[PDB]
Amino acid sequence: HMIGDMNELLLKSVEVLPPLPDTVSKLRKYVSEANIETMKVAEIISSDPLMTAKLLQLANSPYYGFTREITTINQVITLLGVGNIINIVMADSIRDNFKIDVSPYGLNTQNFLKTCNEEATFIANWLNDEDKKLSHLLVPCAMLLRLGIVIFSNFLIQNHKDKDFLAFLNKNENLALAENEFLGVDHISFLGFLLHRWNFDDVLIESICFVRTPHAAREKVKKSAYALAITDHLFAPHDGSSPFNAKAAVALLKEAKTQGINFDLNNLLSKLPNKAKENLNKED
């Protein structure tokens, strides 16, 4: 009600975040059957929005003295070690009631999580050769973006507003308007508040915050804001890779080029998901 209050409630709601059950299963299998490879651990974590957030938070903590300097899952693994990561992923907060459930947004949770992994996979596929440093930054950006609606959904469910929210959203078809109506804030703004409070790096934060206006970001944030917006047009849960959104992704690559940010047009096109490729010529 007071500008900034909702932000603090939401913050409290994510003081404990569980891992995805799939992360727990994959990590337990890999560990039981292993000596440890960091890359295999990274591959499991990198598709988990919740662990991405908690692990980056812990890694940017004053305890380690690299505050606001850790932005990648590889850096996280390097700083934290696999031992801490295992212990955090296997942990069980018995009394904790965090719900991993995007049904308030009209989404199938299992499909949403599977598409998160396809998006993570796409980013690496698209950029690991072309711009490896950007790929390493961008996967966490995209996962953190996806965490927005996971946090919002849990909050709505904990507070018995999820049904009213879904009804409103089903009827009105605009996420930010529904969020402002029920929470007083949108999830992208909240992510900016949240990630600043948790000592994340400013370029990562601002890539997320400027995803809707990448041209308006600071010069050093533009490349990643553009790349995140391209990805989001392709992988957004509600309308990712629609004719409109597929075209809009390609267009954005060409706009970034006008400012001397060089994405290879052909490389993106050849790497587009099938849905997007097939939609590129259809009417909006």
Q: b or e along 215-224 (b: 16 or more beta carbons within 10 Å of the residue's beta carbon)?
A: eebeeebbbb
Residue 249 tokens read as 């992704």
Return the number of other C-beta atoms located less than 10 Å from residue 122's C-beta: 20
Our count of domains for the chain comes to: 1
Taking the C-alpha atoms of residue 185 and residue 203, their distance in angstroms, rounded to an integer, is 22
Determine contact, residues 152/191, Cβ cutoff 8 Å: no
CATH of the domain at 230: 1.10.3210.10
For this PDB entry, the determination method is: X-ray
Contact 148, 188 (CB under 8 A): yes
- Burial bucket for residue 32 (CB in 10 Å: 0-12, 13-18, 19+): exposed
What DSSP state is assigned to residue 63? G
Rounded (10°) angle between helices 162-172 and 132-158: 120
- Report yes or no: 218 and 201 within 8 Å, Cβ to Cβ: no
Q: Residues with Cβ < 8 Å from 208, sequence gap 6 or more?
A: 141, 144, 145, 188, 191, 192, 195, 228
Kindly provide the resolution of this structure in angstroms, with one decimal. 2.2
CA 212, CA 56: separation in Å to the nearest integer? 24
Q: In the numeric block, which tokens belong to residue 89?
A: 């992923």
Domain housing 61: 1-284
**DSSP string covering 184-219:** SS-HHHHHHHHHHHTT--HHHHHHHHTTT-GGGS-H
Q: What is the DSSP-derived secondary structure letter of residue 105?
A: G
- Provide the 10 A C-beta neighbour count for residue 257: 14
Alpha-carbon gap, residue 151 to 282, rounded angstroms:
34
